[PDB]
Amino acid sequence: NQPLPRLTVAPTYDSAMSNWISTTIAFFIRVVNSVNMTATVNDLTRRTM
Amino acid sequence: AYNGLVTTVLSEDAFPDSSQSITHLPSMWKCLFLTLAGPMTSDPHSPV
Q1: Looking at CA atoms only, how far is residue B44 from chain A in angstroms?
Q2: Partner B contacted by A6 (CB < 8 A)
Q3: Chain B within 8 Å of A8 (Cβ-Cβ)?
Q4: How far apart are alpha carbons A48 and A25 in whole angstroms?
Q5: Which residue of A has its CA nearest to B18?
Q6: Is A38 helix (H, G, I), strand (E, B) or coil?
Q7: Residue-wise over A1-10: b if at least 16 C-beta within 10 A, else e?
Q8: Pick from A34, A44, B1, B24: CA 20 to 30 A from residue B34's CA?
């Protein structure tokens, strides 16, 4: 955590929660593009995933 | 003339609250009307 500011705030990716959200999504993309899903799932429905 | 018997001071509703930032325009407009009505008051703590 960090103390609050009284300047105007804006969504930022610096926050740890954001980092956690980013890594899991990034990691899953690797699950979708793994060999365990390349052989079964069609490629056109893998780019949507 | 009657300073020391009654001192006219700025109102407690005149100052902007501590929390609002200067980015809020009506809270900085109450700071302009306060600095101009500053030395008219006979409070010696008015210039602080």
Answers
A1: 31
A2: yes
A3: yes
A4: 14
A5: A6
A6: helix
A7: eeeeeeeeee
A8: B1
